[PDB]
RNA sequence: UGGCGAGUGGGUGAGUGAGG
DNA sequence: CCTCACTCACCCACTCGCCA
């Protein structure tokens, strides 16, 4: 069907440091009203931000009755999580290959739920490689990290 | 048996801090 | 783009420990 391209990014200043500040960015295009850069609530990490930037884009897509999404992110962790690992985790009790608990289980659960009824082409952006959509999403993510949660 | 911690080797990609 | 110091967490092995 007709697909729509969206660029997502999760960022986190001071990732792994004493005062991390995580933000999500979702870019639909120049001057698109759904473009957002907002603060990530909860645990402040880059991995959570990258997951919930994709979450936000999908929820926004649903509010527009869009069920075919070309979703760009630079997070292979998010992409491989949602297209591969989640199926294994629902079957094995959300255990990593080291036999440990999946740290961001509740975020992958939430994302897994949002992909229901969606046809999503998950795309890795090569990360700093001329894709202005990625740069615009990154900029919005940084803006959101400055805001309050 | 059931949990947990710390490492080593390899891999996938990200997010940073101080600088210039 | 460069240097120096790092975390985020998955894919796969392997080694050492701690609990009951």
From Swiss-Prot:
Is Cell division one of the keywords UniProt gives this record?
no
What does the record list as GO biological process?
Answer: DNA replication, removal of RNA primer; RNA catabolic process
Which GO cellular component terms are attached? mitochondrial matrix; mitochondrion
Q: What is the effect of changing residue 49 to V?
A: In PEOB2; has partial residual endonuclease activity
Catalytic activity reads: Endonucleolytic cleavage to 5'-phosphomonoester
Q: Which residues are involved in binding Mg(2+) 2?
A: 9, 138
Keywords attached to this entry: Cytoplasm, Disease variant, Endonuclease, Hydrolase, Magnesium, Metal-binding, Nuclease, Primary mitochondrial disease, Progressive external ophthalmoplegia
UniProt cofactor note: Binds 1 Mg(2+) ion per subunit. May bind a second metal ion at a regulatory site, or after substrate binding.
Q: Report residues binding Mg(2+) 1.
A: 9, 50, 74
Q: Give the enzyme class.
A: hydrolase
Subcellular location per the Swiss-Prot or TrEMBL entry: Cytoplasm
| Free-text tissue specificity from the UniProt record | Ubiquitous.
- State the function annotated in the UniProt record: Endonuclease that specifically degrades the RNA of RNA-DNA hybrids. Plays a role in RNA polymerase II (RNAp II) transcription termination by degrading R-loop RNA-DNA hybrid formation at G-rich pause sites located downstream of the poly(A) site and behind the elongating RNAp II.
**Protein name, per record:** Ribonuclease H1
**Gene encoding the protein:** RNASEH1
Parent protein range shown?
137 to 285 of 286
């Amino acid at each position: 069907g007709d697909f729509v391209v969206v660029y997502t990014d999760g960022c986190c200043s001071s990732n792994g440091r004493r005062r991390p500040r995580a933000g999500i960015g979702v870019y639909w295009g120049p001057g698109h009203p759904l473009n957002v850069g907002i603060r990530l609530p909860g645990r402040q990490t880059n991995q959570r931000a990258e997951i919930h930037a994709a979450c936000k884009a999908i929820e926004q897509a649903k509010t527009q009755n869009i069920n075919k999404l070309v979703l760009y992110t630079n997070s292979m962790f998010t992409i491989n999580g949602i297209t591969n690992w989640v199926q294994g985790w629902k079957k094995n009790g959300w255990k990593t290959s080291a036999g440990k608990e999946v740290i961001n289980k509740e975020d992958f659960v939430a994302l897994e739920r949002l992909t229901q009824g969606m046809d999503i082409q998950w795309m890795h952006v090569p990360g700093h490689s001329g894709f202005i959509g990625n740069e615009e999403a990154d900029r919005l993510a940084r803006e959101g990290a400055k805001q309050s949660e």
